[PDB]
């Protein structure tokens, strides 16, 4: 199928209690493979998947060098933006950066991403065409001129369409055993009487990969988003994912309701019903 | 691999 590589950067200022906290993580699909923490002892880019340890000392030196460099630029950026918004030195402020590429089944470029936020809100983001920027507010408009003058769009596109794609290809190959696997969900259904005239059906999906899954409820065939509860797809901790969906149902009519579980690893869409 | 073209905001 299609695949993605994503890098996530978080810088948080601690005015008075030392230099800003910087954390970088690398992802291929829903699997993490690299990590950097500015507060960790090692002061290195560390591996968080087995298949990235195939890379030699040149990779780890360069990635360590470049992630340290990012944190240095963010440290200046935290000062610059503090100015733009006329904020005090006392306040703790966050910069977040997400960038990465998507490839089709053939491993060729599909889409590129690079979005930036200040205090958990849009600041600047690269458009789909990867030639122009969208600034969210007045402050970001100043960043937009600097990045236009520096031809940052062209260099980001060159990365997203080149180095990003061909490194994603390398990782998918080295990690084929895990990254191109599709584990089907272990599905079951639990019943909890709410009162004497109501009962909650809960449809379970356990130990599936990747994270993409759809859990819908049907009553006599027709779809049900009314009296429906849905939790965020959560990590098991072993590299698999968990999810459930529940419906408040009248007592006696449990058999009328049916859960529908759509997932790649499943040959056909499963159809579960209470025992 | 990390993108290393670092332009100040």
């Amino acid at each position: 199928g299609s695949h993605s590589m994503r890098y996530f950067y978080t810088s948080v200022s601690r005015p008075g209690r030392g230099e800003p906290r910087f954390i970088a993580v690398g992802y291929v699909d829903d699997t993490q493979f690299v990590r950097f923490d500015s507060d960790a002892a090692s002061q290195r880019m560390e591996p968080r998947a087995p298949w990235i340890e195939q890379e030699g000392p040149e990779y780890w030196d360069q990635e360590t060098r470049n992630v340290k460099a990012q944190s240095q630029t963010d440290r200046v950026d935290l000062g610059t933006l503090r100015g733009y918004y006329n904020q005090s030195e006392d306040g703790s402020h966050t910069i977040q950066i997400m960038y990465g590429c998507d490839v089709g089944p053939d491993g060729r470029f599909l889409r590129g991403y690079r979005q930036d936020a200040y205090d958990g809100k849009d600041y600047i983001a690269l458009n789909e065409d990867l030639r122009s920027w969208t600034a969210a507010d007045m402050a970001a408009q100043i960043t937009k001129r600097k990045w236009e003058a520096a031809h940052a769009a062209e260099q980001q596109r060159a990365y997203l369409e080149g180095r990003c794609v061909e490194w994603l290809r390398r990782y998918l190959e080295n990690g084929k055993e895990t990254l191109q696997r599709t584990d089907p969900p272990k599905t079951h259904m639990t019943h909890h009487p709410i009162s004497d005239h109501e009962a909650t059906l809960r449809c379970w999906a356990l130990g599936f990969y990747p994270a993409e899954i759809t859990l819908t409820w049907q009553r006599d065939g027709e779809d049900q988003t009314q009296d429906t509860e849905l939790v965020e797809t959560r990590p098991a901790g072993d590299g698999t994912f968990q999810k459930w969906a529940a419906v408040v149902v009248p007592s006696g009519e449990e058999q009328r309701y049916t859960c529908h579980v759509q997932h790649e690893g499943l040959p056909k869409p499963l159809t579960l019903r209470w025992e | 691999e990390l993108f290393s073209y670092l332009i100040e905001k």
Partner: T-cell receptor
Amino acid sequence: GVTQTPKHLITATGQRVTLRCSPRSGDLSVYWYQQSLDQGLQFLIQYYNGEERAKGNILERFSAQQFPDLHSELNLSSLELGDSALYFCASSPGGGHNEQFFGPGTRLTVLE
Amino acid sequence: KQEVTQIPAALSVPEGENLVLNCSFTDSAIYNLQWFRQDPGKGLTSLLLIQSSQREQTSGRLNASLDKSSGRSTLYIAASQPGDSATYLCAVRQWGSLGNLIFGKGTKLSVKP
């Protein structure tokens, strides 16, 4: 607007010298380059906002530093005849991917 | 592995003539290629910066072309003058590196008055 001191320096083998570099006002980046007839222009080391950012082929006996005021000092220890060269520092307003403005350079001669 | 070469290393042209200065790089993975001027025993002055997306950059009598994959960049000097007489230095910045320059040995231009 980059200044380097001293402008010329004659020195004996085995001794230690310090080359000073003041970047342009408001510039965050300082790069150090060595120019010899032998090797041409070669990247030694670069600093960003008081911190080391990247190393080149700097020898163990060469160390450098960027101070809080953003000025830089390059220290050359156990000097050999071969170290005779022009040592340029270049400052940059950002990281130095677009612009690198060079100082007039410190000409080091190492004699026996 | 990135080797920047400028051949010929010495060019001698009559005054007023169009001249061609050559640059080569073995690895096409570059952010940009920057042409520099050096008067003897003095600092470098930036002539033209060519971004990897651009095929052409012009400024006065200086014109510079780039093809990354070919590993080629040419610097043209129209109506050459004695004042142009200097060493012309070619440099590139590597993908995955933080902006440091990798220089050629330079071409010493002598515009004969």
